[PDB]
């Protein structure tokens, strides 16, 4: 009667925050790109044709983009993908031979400071006897002299081993949906204004996240999801000048990057089996890679960010933009991949401004490096094989990674500079609206129900 | 008022609804609980824990006086120390998420009074009652 009795319910909407092993999903057309397994999609699960989003009415859940484990899982996934993708590839161990290089064939000036070097060296053929006098063409960032001609060496021969990327695979970022196993679920924040931390008013659940392309880049966030209405400013600690400031754009910034060098692929044979893809002579003029950003689009984008920065640093304050402080080449430049090559662009023409409380294109100098050691990894050095023909790419600038100086003088003006380094921040710009929860369908509740006595 | 019948909210649909209203959606969260070289082994270990989590709940659901899923009753008096709330104050004024946050402290205690005091003493009573 009035004295209650417990009753077991199975299938109750009860979840608690937890961490699990997420699997992948990447459409069915992404598997049709073939080309001997591009990137990752080999045994990845085809995406559900009609994904479902159940809008959880009256539900308010707290998210935390800076302590979200989906990021820490994705970062370790792409890294293992990189090592697994270089395991059956050609290893360039006998390429650390002495290189007798000279300037590339051009006509002065003395300010061209070479950059491109025409290197000649010995090489092992298929047989283990007679040698091989072959030549290649390396970038200045890939070689380093050592003390008759001027003598160089590969910049990684004194750091770690080196492996050549197979020409069969491609570095094209393809959409990857992250899904949760049975009994688990992924919550999605649907508010138009959300800084990644705190309770979310309009929460919906999904089984698989939207298509997130693993674009590895620094300083400039490329091809990401645009924010809603006004641009968003997200940071783990605004008061701390040591924590990075992730910015998300509303309107995409058209960026145009080219490689004005018709390269030729020389396929020298270091047999038996293995084959190295050298750089032959260049067809045409010796020009350097560059990226263009329309001054009109960039002026409006920067003015929309500084107006949002004043909501945190005082209404009437002066915000000045300056380029990077220094360090590695991957931190001071806009590192990205386009057509297989690895560009490194000078962003000193983008962060040169000073905004108070109230028709052409911007060309940026881009250098190219072939031998890389991404993700702060030592031991595994990758030689990006040369790409034939002029490479052209058009991307969307959808966000920034800024750092603030400590020089203060705090209540007056504030200076912001481009940062990066940790690529884990790059995943946080897309996983800010997702989190993993555990379903506990077992919930007990009292009611005026008693069982039998097998009467 | 006029009505055109029942509607559907989906998986975890009635998460923000009252416990009494969310008790109608039990057969929805029960449906999607099982759902039918490396990187391919990552999903295998996930699909193994999914069924371990299912049989874990099914074993608990079996050793209690239920086995038959969805809903089931028990002969255990609700101790007043476990947040003394009313019948009309729980099913018509509380969500399952808000409720599990309060009873989380006594969930493990209640589980013990269900497996031991009941089907071990109830079924043994049936062995004495079924022989005559």
């Amino acid at each position, epitope marked *: 009667a009035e004295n209650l009795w417990v009753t077991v319910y199975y299938g109750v909407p009860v979840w608690k925050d937890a961490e699990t092993t997420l699997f992948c999903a990447s459409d069915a057309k992404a598997y049709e790109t073939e080309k001997h397994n591009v990137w990752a999609t080999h045994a990845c699960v085809p995406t559900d044709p*009609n994904p479902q989003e*159940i*809008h959880l*009415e009256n539900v308010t859940e707290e998210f935390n983009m800076w302590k979200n484990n989906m990021v820490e899982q994705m970062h370790t996934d792409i890294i293992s993908l990189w090592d697994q993708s270089l395991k059956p590839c050609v290893k360039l161990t006998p390429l650390c031979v002495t290189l007798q290089c000279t300037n590339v064939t051009n006509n002065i000036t003395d300010d061209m400071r070479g950059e491109l070097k025409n290197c000649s060296f010995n090489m092992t053929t298929e047989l283990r006897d007679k040698k091989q006098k072959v030549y290649s063409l390396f970038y200045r960032l890939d070689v380093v002299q050592i003390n008759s001609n001027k003598e160089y060496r590969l910049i990684n021969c004194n750091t770690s081993a080196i492996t050549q990327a197979c020409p069969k695979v491609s570095f094209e970022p393809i959409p990857i949906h992250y899904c949760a196993p049975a009994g688990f679920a992924i919550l999605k924040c*649907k*508010d*138009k204004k959300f800084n990644g931390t705190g309770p979310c008013p*309009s929460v*919906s659940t999904v089984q698989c996240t939207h298509g997130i392309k693993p674009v590895v880049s620094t300083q400039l966030l490329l091809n990401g999801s645009l924010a809603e209405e006004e641009v968003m400013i997200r940071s783990e600690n605004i008061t701390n000048n040591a924590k990075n400031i992730l910015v998300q754009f509303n309107t995409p910034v058209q960026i145009n990057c080219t490689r004005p060098n018709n390269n030729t692929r020389k396929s020298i044979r270091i047999g038996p089996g293995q084959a190295f893809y050298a750089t032959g002579d260049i067809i045409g003029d010796i020009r350097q890679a560059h990226c263009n950003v329309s001054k009109a689009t960039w002026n409006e984008t920067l003015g929309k960010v500084v107006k949002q920065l004043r909501k945190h640093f005082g209404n009437n304050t002066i915000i000045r933009f300056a380029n990077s402080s220094g360090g590695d080449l991957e931190v001071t430049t806009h590192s990205f991949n386009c057509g297989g090559e690895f560009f490194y662009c000078n962003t000193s023409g983008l962060f040169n401004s000073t905004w108070i409380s109230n028709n052409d294109s911007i060309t940026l100098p881009c250098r190219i490096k072939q031998i890389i050691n991404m993700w702060q990894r030592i031991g595994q050095a990758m030689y990006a094989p040369p790409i034939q023909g002029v490479i052209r790419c058009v991307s969307n600038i959808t966000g920034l990674i800024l750092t603030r100086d400590g020089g203060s003088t705090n209540s007056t003006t504030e200076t912001f500079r481009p940062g990066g380094g940790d690529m884990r921040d790059n995943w946080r710009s897309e996983l800010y609206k997702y989190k993993v929860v555990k379903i506990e369908p077992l919930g007990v509740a009292p009611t005026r129900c008693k069982r039998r006595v097998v009467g | *008022a*006029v*009505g*055109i*019948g*029942a*509607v*559907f*909210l*989906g998986f975890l*649909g009635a998460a923000g609804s009252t416990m009494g209203a969310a008790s109608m959606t039990l057969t929805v969260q029960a449906r999607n609980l099982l759902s039918g070289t490396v990187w391919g082994i990552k999903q295998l270990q996930a699909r193994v824990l999914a069924v371990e989590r299912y049989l874990r709940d099914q074993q608990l659901l079996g050793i209690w006086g239920c086995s038959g899923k969805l809903i089931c009753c028990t002969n255990v008096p609700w101790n007043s120390s476990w947040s003394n709330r009313n019948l009309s104050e729980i099913w018509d004024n509380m969500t399952w998420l808000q409720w599990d946050k309060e009873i989380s402290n006594y969930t493990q205690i209640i589980y013990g009074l269900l497996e031991e005091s009941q089907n071990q003493q109830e079924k043994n009573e049936q062995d004495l009652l079924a022989l005559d």
Partner: antibody
Amino acid sequence: QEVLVQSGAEVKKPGASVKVSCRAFGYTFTGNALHWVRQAPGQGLEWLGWINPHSGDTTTSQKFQGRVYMTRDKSINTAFLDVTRLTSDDTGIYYCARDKYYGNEAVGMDVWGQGTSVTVSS
Amino acid sequence: DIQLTQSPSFLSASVGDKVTITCRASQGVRNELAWYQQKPGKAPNLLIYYASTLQSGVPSRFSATGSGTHFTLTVSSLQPEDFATYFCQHMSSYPLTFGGGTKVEIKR
């Protein structure tokens, strides 16, 4: 986030039929009954009927019974209104509107589509 | 059908006035009655349901009363965005019907 998006304006001749669509975003399409309401230019609001998107069951205002037809496609979160045997009296703006549907009954229309203009003329 | 009659059809008021508009039903509809706001060129917005309950996000200056055949909607102090047409609607039986509308205009 919770919005209804309707198809664009349409013109039809008398006697023909028009099919207008309404797609639900930001909520579970099958969780709320859906009304269709029209407004002749300069006039008030007239209820045509409503549909349960879960079951597909419909009830039509008897003035329009056998002339106006309500259907749904759950996969695309979209409801359809077929208005047949048109005359000039059917000219106006057509709205879809979600009902709060508390207690599985009509309570109030809390989210409206932007409306679809339909003109019937020769 | 049930007829809902709103009065007045056209109400003139100044910014700051307290005003009350009336909706009468030809038969008893209990509390099963909603109020809407409509502006030229826009879809209606829900203000009131269950005859007296404020819809989420509607400003507190809106209130409503009544049961049976007599209903009112009151604005405690009119603001410029409140001058618009207002409709009442019953859901007590088929077919659903709307009132003829009350247009609130600014005095000058």
